[PDB]
């Protein structure tokens, strides 16, 4: 059933290998696990804030 | 797609008394929600559609208001006929998602069950496998468990449980609770017990057995 | 009076079709959306589709998205649900109801529900193993034998004492579904104990979707 | 043993036109399919294989898709190079077949031939036999024919015919049709006639003449 | 860079046999089918065998079972075809060409065909026979004049007019097989009508097999 890639270095653009990475996001109706960095900013020291 | 969650999971209250069941959406579903009830061996029935709309065919008792986010259902006065499980429908964004669904008991007076135990017959070991088998008839309430213990330890990923639907006057019901072990187990231990617990058990039901007994 | 009437329902091996229909009196299509719900046995309800009667268009829940495709017919007042590519995993009792609007609203009236089953094991007519009452003293002074019905498809069966005489002090299990590919469900009957030496006691399984029956004498054992 | 129907036998379309071509299998073929294209006097170039798989150093131009049972070898649009005979092949079953091939034409402007009858001459006769030669010179497209009439009357079973290729840049072709004779059947007719049709003749050219003419 | 290469194509009388054989380069040979097809002229493709390189077995066309043995060598990284006893019928440009497995792929290179002719004529130079242009009004005031160049074996013959010199306005047949076992092909040139009594129109019929050529001048005839 599987057979290799005819990953040649002589093939043009639409034969090269390319990796991808999809990232996905799951969100149900539970706790987020994937949590805790709600927006932070920097510090500014001397003035009012 | 919004999803539903219904509480309390299980309502107890006697025949006469106000119940309340409430909804909460994850997101805004405007008003169309729907509260049905559902009774053992039967569909669904609606009894209110859009959050506020009565169906028709259903009795004046249910009822149901919103505050916020929080959808409130109440049915005014219980009766003898209203012992059902209940749910509710978000028809807003689609996939249109139901909640969990809850339960609601009768409060009748609280009493241990009638307990059998089945040994592993010489026919059912023909199999080259043993069951035994624990039998809790006609008790009350809906909650029980059967811990089971094999020369005298307490047992665990060894038993698989079937509990049955309650009865439509006093709502009892019967748990039935087993032992898997290959033939070949069965003959390494000499005593099985069946331990049962629950609310109307003073003391937890104690039924044993030695291998090879009945 | 306002009448759902659903029809069709049936069994379907995989890779079938199967079609529902639901006709509607009392009232017309026409303003109207209408929807089917499926309730898979053991479960909760799911949505799985919509159509606008005045509209012609339809949503699907994302689930059933190119398996299950929804219609509506204003000229017979009636609406349909197309099931292809169907599966075990689809088996479920199906609902016809209607809404106003594509949304937003509620679901006002429901029918009752057709049931579809399907299974590794297509179908099979039940069997039945005894259960022995103890020989301990029990509390009432009350006993009971009883039985399993095992090995049966599809569901519903319907369990009874004595060869169908005996309904009192009967208690029945509903069935579940097992690693067979059949269904299975335990029943017992309550009496003073003296009376389980005297009253014959026979299960009666009676299995009308394979067209058989099971009488089973269940009778105390030594012990 | 699978049989393969391609169809159309010839497709004519322009330079930056979008071209389809399929084929049918018999039976089923599973994803055993391939097409391929071929230019005069060169191998044929894999373009597709398993279906929808390009292959490596085709155009991206080409791609393919299957509905219920029917493959389709599809052009995005035509470039001057994409002008060949197109195949189709499956290797699902033994014996393996190939189709019977699409010819693809540049779809230039339409135009009739030049037209000369050479009637057998005295000195051709010399061999007993006798042949009438009709041709049709620099035309376009690449079908055409010749209906013979011998007194008036349509001739059938005595002719032969063969066409030039097309030319590398106005794909013209010239186009034979003979007739053949043995001399005593030549003296057994009074007027041979050659009927010219194609797409670019609205009126079909007739050149005929009488035994012993040239 | 992947290639093949076939050879041992040739003229061998009925009766007789040939080898062909196909050597390949930028890839191996174990693991893949090496297949040959014919190719008669004039005719589409037919496949004749395949064989499995890791395997040792093969497979046949119907249309050529007992006549062609197919066989594969991978210490060469070569091929054969052993073709016996040959007719008049087997004649064919014959290829190699790659698939995988066993089978259920179809082929992905190929070679570009070496040409086998066996008829009942083993050779012969061409002879031309002229003809006349046409004597009345033409469409675009053009006219040609051509020949027919006959009964030579085997094909190829390279057709030009005024001895080679003239190209302008040359159409040829590709060659047909007739009754003789000799082949044959029609050419012209067309040229304004005024140029066919001014200009020079020899069929020059190069047929290098044979080591002769035939120089014909066509020329317009009264009628």
């Known amino acids: 059933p599987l057979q290799s890639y005819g990953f040649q270095p002589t093939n043009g653009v639409g034969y090269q290998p390319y990796r991808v990475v999809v990232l996905s996001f799951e969100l149900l109706h539970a706790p987020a696990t994937v949590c805790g960095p709600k927006k932070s900013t920097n510090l500014v020291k001397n003035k009012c804030v | 797609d919004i999803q539903m969650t219904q509480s309390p999971s299980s309502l107890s209250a006697s025949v006469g008394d106000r119940v309340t069941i409430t909804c909460r959406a994850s997101?805004?579903?405007?008003?169309?929600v729907a509260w049905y009830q559902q009774k053992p061996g039967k569909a669904p029935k609606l009894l209110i559609y859009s959050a506020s709309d009565l169906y028709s065919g259903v009795p004046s008792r249910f009822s149901g208001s919103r505050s916020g986010t929080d959808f409130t259902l109440t049915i005014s006065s219980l009766q003898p006929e209203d012992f059902a499980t209940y749910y509710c429908q978000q028809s807003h964004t689609y996939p249109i998602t139901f909640g969990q669904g809850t339960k609601v008991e009768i409060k009748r007076t609280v009493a241990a069950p009638s307990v059998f135990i089945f040994p592993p017959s010489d026919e059912q070991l023909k199999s080259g496998t043993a069951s035994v088998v624990c039998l809790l008839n006609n008790f009350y309430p809906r909650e029980a468990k059967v811990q089971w213990k094999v020369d005298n330890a307490l047992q665990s990923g060894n038993s698989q449980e079937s509990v049955t639907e309650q009865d439509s006057k006093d709502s009892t019901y019967s748990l039935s609770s087993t032992l898997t072990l290959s033939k070949a187990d069965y003959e390494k231990h000499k005593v099985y017990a069946c331990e049962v617990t629950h609310q109307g058990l003073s003391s937890p039901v104690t039924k044993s057995f030695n291998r090879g007994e009945c | 009076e306002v009448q759902l009437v659903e029809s069709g329902g049936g069994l379907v091996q995989p890779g079938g079709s199967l079609r529902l229909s639901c006709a509607a009196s009392?009232?017309?299509?026409?303003?109207?959306?209408m929807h089917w719900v499926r309730q898979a046995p053991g479960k909760g309800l799911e949505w799985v589709a919509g159509?606008?009667?005045?509209?012609?268009?339809?949503a699907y829940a994302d689930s059933v998205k190119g398996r299950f495709t929804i219609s509506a017919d204003t000229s017979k007042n009636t609406a349909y649900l197309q099931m292809n590519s169907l599966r075990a995993e689809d088996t479920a009792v199906y609902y016809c109801?209607?809404?106003?609007?594509?949304?937003?609203?509620?679901?006002?009236?429901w029918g009752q529900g057709t049931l579809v089953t399907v299974s590794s094991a297509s179908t099979k007519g039940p069997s039945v193993f005894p259960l022995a009452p103890s020989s301990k003293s029990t509390s009432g002074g009350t006993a009971a034998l009883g039985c399993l019905v095992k090995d049966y498809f599809p569901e519903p069966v319907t369990v009874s004492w004595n060869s169908g005489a005996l309904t009192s002090g009967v208690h029945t299990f509903p069935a579940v579904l097992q690693s067979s590919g059949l269904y299975s469900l335990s029943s017992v009957v309550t009496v003073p104990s003296s009376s389980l030496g005297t009253q014959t006691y026979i299960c009666n399984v009676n299995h009308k979707p394979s067209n058989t029956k099971v009488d089973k004498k269940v009778e105390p054992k030594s012990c | 043993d699978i049989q393969m129907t391609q169809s159309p036998s010839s497709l004519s379309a322009s330079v930056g036109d979008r071209v389809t071509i399929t084929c049918?299998?018999?039976?089923?073929?599973?994803?055993?399919?391939?097409?391929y294209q071929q230019k005069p006097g060169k191998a044929p170039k894999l373009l597709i294989y398993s279906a929808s798989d390009l292959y490596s150093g085709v155009p991206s131009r080409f791609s393919g898709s299957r509905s219920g049972t029917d493959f389709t070898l599809t052009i995005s649009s035509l470039q001057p190079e994409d002008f060949a005979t197109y195949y189709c092949q499956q290797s699902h079953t033994y014996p393996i077949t190939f189709g019977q091939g699409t010819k693809v034409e540049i779809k230039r402007t339409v135009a009739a031939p030049s037209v000369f009858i050479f009637p057998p001459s005295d000195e051709q006769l010399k061999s007993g036999t006798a042949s009438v030669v009709c041709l049709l010179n620099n035309f376009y497209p690449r079908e055409a024919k010749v209906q013979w009439k011998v007194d008036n009357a349509l001739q059938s079973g005595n002719s032969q015919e063969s066409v030039t290729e097309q030319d590398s840049k106005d794909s013209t072709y010239s186009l034979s049709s003979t007739l053949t004779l043995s001399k005593a059947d030549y003296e057994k007719h009074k007027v041979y006639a050659c009927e010219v049709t194609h797409q670019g003749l609205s009126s079909p050219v007739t050149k005929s003449f009488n035994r012993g003419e040239c | 860079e992947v290639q093949l290469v076939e050879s041992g194509g040739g003229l061998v009388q009925p009766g007789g046999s040939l080898r062909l054989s196909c050597?390949?380069?930028?890839?191996?040979?174990?693991?893949?089918?090496?297949?040959?097809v014919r190719q008669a002229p004039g005719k589409g493709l037919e496949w004749?065998?395949?064989?499995?390189?890791?395997?040792?077995?093969?497979?046949?066309?119907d249309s050529v079972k007992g006549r062609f043995t197919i066989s594969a060598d991978t210490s060469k990284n070569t091929a054969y075809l052993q073709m016996n006893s040959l007719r008049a019928e087997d004649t064919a440009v014959?290829?190699?060409?790659?698939?995988?497995?066993?089978?259920?792929?179809?082929?992905?290179?190929?070679?570009?065909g070496t040409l086998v002719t066996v008829s009942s004529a083993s050779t012969k130079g061409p002879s031309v026979f002229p003809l006349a242009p046409s004597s009345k009004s033409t469409s675009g005031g053009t006219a040609a004049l051509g020949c027919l160049v006959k009964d030579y074996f085997p094909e190829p013959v390279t057709v030009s007019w005024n001895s080679g010199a003239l190209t302008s306005g040359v159409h040829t047949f590709p060659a047909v097989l007739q009754s003789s076992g000799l082949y044959s092909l029609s050419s012209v040139v067309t040229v304004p009508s005024s140029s066919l009594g001014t200009q020079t129109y020899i069929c020059n019929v190069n047929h290098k097999p044979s080591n002769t050529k035939v120089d014909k001048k066509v020329e317009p005839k009264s009628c």
């Open positions: 997101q805004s579903v405007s008003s169309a």
């Open positions: 159509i606008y009667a005045s509209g012609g268009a339809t």
């Open positions: 009392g009232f017309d299509l026409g303003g109207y959306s």
């Open positions: 109801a209607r809404s106003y609007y594509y949304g937003g609203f509620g679901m006002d009236y």
